[PDB]
């Protein structure tokens, strides 16, 4: 049975996304423009939706029960890991299979492989970071298992740099059997099946898709010319 | 060493 307290943290993870996500994407007239045309000509715009999405996600954050619990530096080595990881979750709502972009209202602000490219990732990272979105889109998840999911990564134990990981390890633990015993109740078969595994290979698939890019972000950020592009925050959270 | 990280949390 889904206890009390579960469900209690799934009410609050829910608000917690619809109060940093915006399905109508009214904010990314504030990026600077985007430019299809021309190297690294997509790279402004994006880089300031990151920054933007990354905010997001330090707002999502915040709201999770138990992250407040932990130390500063904790906090900080969590999100500093996981915020690519989460962006590349949250993204998951504008991306569709119809395309292979991410779909955000508008032509300007539809997104594909080109428009990646431009913007100095290589495919090294696109081709399976594709892969990944179609993989959970085919997971059909219930917005309940996508924002537990998300907390969940973000509080990972196992995070580099982390002082109190028994206490992450608990904050963490009660989320997964949050989302397994939600699982269990409220998600019918056939879907149901094998489903919490095929949620923690996500998180697996994350690690390496982090680790890519942060290879790729130090290509880009080692030349001064392109670091002079990003947001200082982008600078501040990826390095 | 990251004041705006940390700035957002708080
Ligand atoms: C609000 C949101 C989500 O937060 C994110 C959205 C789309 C996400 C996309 C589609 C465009 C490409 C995105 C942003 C991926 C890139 C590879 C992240 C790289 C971050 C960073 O290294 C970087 C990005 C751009 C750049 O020019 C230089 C550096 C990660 C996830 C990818 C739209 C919408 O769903």
Redesign the pocket.
């Known amino acids: 049975k889904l206890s009390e307290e579960q469900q209690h943290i799934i009410a609050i993870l829910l608000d917690a996304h619809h109060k940093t996500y915006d399905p109508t994407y009214a904010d990314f007239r504030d990026f600077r423009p985007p430019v299809r045309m021309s190297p690294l000509s997509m ?1 402004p715009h ?2 300031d ?2 920054s933007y ?1 990354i905010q997001k996600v330090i707002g999502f954050a915040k709201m999770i029960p138990g992250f407040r619990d932990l130390t500063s530096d904790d906090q900080i080595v969590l999100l500093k890991s996981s915020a ?1 990881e989460v ?2 979750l ?2 998951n ?2 991306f569709t299979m119809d395309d292979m972009s ?1 779909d ?1 209202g508008s032509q300007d602000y539809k ?1 594909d492989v080109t428009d ?1 490219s431009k ?3 290589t495919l090294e ?1 696109i081709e399976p ?1 594709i892969k990944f979105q179609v993989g959970l889109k085919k997971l059909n998840l219930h917005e309940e298992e996508h924002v537990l999911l998300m907390a969940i990564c973000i509080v990972s134990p196992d995070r580099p740099g982390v002082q109190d990981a028994k206490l992450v390890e608990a904050i963490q633990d009660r989320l997964s059997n949050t989302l397994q015993t939600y699982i269990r109740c409220r998600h019918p078969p056939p879907g149901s099946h094998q489903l919490y595994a095929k949620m923690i290979q996500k998180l697996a698939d994350l690690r390496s898709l982090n680790e890519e ?1 942060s290879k790729q ?1 130090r290509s ?1 950020s080692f030349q001064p010319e392109n670091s002079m592009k ?1 947001t200082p925050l982008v600078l501040e959270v ?1 390095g | 060493n990251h004041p705006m990280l940390m700035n957002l949390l708080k």
């Open positions: 790279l994006l880089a939706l990151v999405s690519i962006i590349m949250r993204s709502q504008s991410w955000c997104y990646v913007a100095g990732h990272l970071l890019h972000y880009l990003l990826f």
